[PDB]
Design a binder for this molecule. Structure first.
Ligand code: PRO
Ligand code: PRO
Ligand code: PRO
Ligand code: PRO
Ligand code: NA
Ligand code: NA
Ligand code: NA
Ligand code: NA
Lengths: 186, 186, 186, 186
């Protein structure tokens, strides 16, 4: 045939998935859109000995990603180990999406899909830092209050007193509104 | 040269534009997203004599599309004509998008981008047919009512009475509301 | 890499060796001329997974041919094994060529290079069948006569009487003449 | 398709005809075997604008060769204008082949197919130079005798006296033997 095993593999996935390739096709990017409408990219760098030797691949995830064990590799199987990981993280990105859409995020600026922390502005010179566990994203995040004692001490008290209200069936944002008894600036 | 230049041209275009190719790359589909967020596809069927022989191509437009092509042409050159045609039709698809989003369209069921006619229900017992000129999409379209006389007579009188109020700076739907003095079922 | 390396390998081999290829270059035929002026062809059927997956191949040999192949192999590497096998069989084809040129062969009609048997007419009323071992083509072959007893009895007696005179430094035809003390119809 | 119009043309002629190509396929050689068993090669150099612009091509003929007029070119049509020319010259190469096989040619050394002259040794310090007309190769060639008057003067006399014996239905060599009443050294 005129084309390499790589090209046959891409044709099988669908050319619509390939969103970048260098001239030698030694670097490619594949896209996947998740069930929630988010686009995710995986970059693969192919060596001379593909598919005997596994490609290097880079993703934007808040957890490690690792692919196959199989004797020879397979862009096909990898892309499917990428889709499964993406669906496994749906709850985490749902939580983060809502926070990013509805609140005033101080840090990070332009958060990648890998970012598990948000520093959210609550008011004049007060913010809350939350660290979300991407595998249990609707539980109580680690919270840290940044500001003067006159504002954050009472928040700490409400947090301890109202913690029983935390409902994992609700979003992180909703639970924060309920447990801290506050409104978030937009 | 042994290989065609097709692959080099796709690279220049950007692999993100290629959304389908058969195994021999004798048929490909390229996508363009217009300034208004709509996706449009062009299918090209190639022969080995490419580019000496123009590819066959198929688009979904409400007007004819015939590319200028010579042996100096490439995917990029037909793709650019395709984009220009798409932008020239922005006003037409803007008018149709609104009608399809806001009214009860009986025909076509799932209108292609080429469809210039709509049958719109004005109730369970009366409809209006419009035929829109894609080159002049906000002028008065050719229309007619279907339904019993007692239902259409009143519409017909309001139409001939308010026909002068038609404002090409307004959408087809808005003008119809103003002329017929009605509300469209959703 | 986008393209296979098949075309580069054919170039290394020399395009003069390629005597057939289908439109997709999934089937090719390579020719070798042996040291004795005989032409031999090998047909290879390739898949996109080449060279990770060994090609299928077909030759016209009187013994099995199984190439050593790994992902480091190329057309050149199987072609070289093919040439080595061809030269190893020079003595066999030298013996068969002489028989086919100088005697009246009844079977096969147009013998392929794989054919190790010949039925040779000793007249209009008697034949001898030989089966030649391609690995030991000048040893005494397995043979038998066909024909009426009065015609074969004399041949059979001369054979058992002169069987010791067989000289492996001589061709099969020459030895048969010396043992049977006869002349072969042309 | 993955391949250029050139590759499709070569596939149509048969890969067995292509006996050389450079890496970029900007230079190729095609072979033709004539009805008389002689091999002839045509070299073609392809430009960027093939097949709009005619390739350059080189042959080894004793007459000019020139190909098409057609609006666009065609390796196919050219190869067939090459085969026809080759068959047209069969008589000329038949005459030259016999001379080269049976006589002692002093010049040229290793004659190409284009060479219309032969200087043939007749004996100690005597030769004959013949110039054959490739379009009328069995007629009396232009003859010139190289040697001392005592040998060449009588040959000149025999040539004039016996010229009526020249028989265009016979080869140049045969006619020379008959008209000059001599034997040619081997
Ligand atoms: O009038 C037109 O142009 C459209 C094209 C498809 C059918 N009607
Ligand atoms: O607006 C309506 O009533 C129609 C009924 C079918 C779907 N929409
Ligand atoms: O004995 C052999 O090996 C040959 C092969 C083809 C049939 N007989
Ligand atoms: O030698 C012979 O007589 C056989 C007859 C058919 C062809 N050769
Ligand atoms: Na793509
Ligand atoms: Na709780
Ligand atoms: Na060839
Ligand atoms: Na004469």
């Amino acid at each position: 045939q005129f084309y390499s095993s790589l090209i046959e593999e891409i044709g099988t996935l669908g050319w619509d998935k390939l969103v970048y390739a260098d001239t030698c096709f030694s670097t490619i990017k594949l896209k996947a859109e998740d069930a929630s409408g988010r686009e995710h990219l995986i970059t693969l760098k192919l060596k001379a000995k593909y598919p005997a030797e596994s490609p290097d691949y880079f993703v934007d995830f808040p957890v490690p990603f690792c692919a196959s064990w199989t004797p020879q590799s397979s862009l096909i199987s990898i892309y499917s180990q990428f889709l499964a990981a993406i669906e496994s993280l749906k709850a985490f990105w749902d939580v983060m999406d809502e926070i990013d859409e509805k609140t005033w995020v101080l840090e990070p600026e332009k958060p990648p899909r890998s970012a598990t922390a948000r520093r959210i502005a609550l008011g004049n010179n007060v913010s809350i830092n939350i660290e979300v566990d991407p595998r249990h994203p609707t539980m109580l995040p680690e919270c840290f209050f940044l500001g003067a004692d006159h504002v954050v001490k009472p928040l700490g008290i409400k947090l301890s007193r109202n913690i029983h209200l935390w409902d994992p069936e609700n979003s992180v944002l909703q639970n924060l509104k309920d447990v801290l008894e506050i409104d978030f600036p937009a």
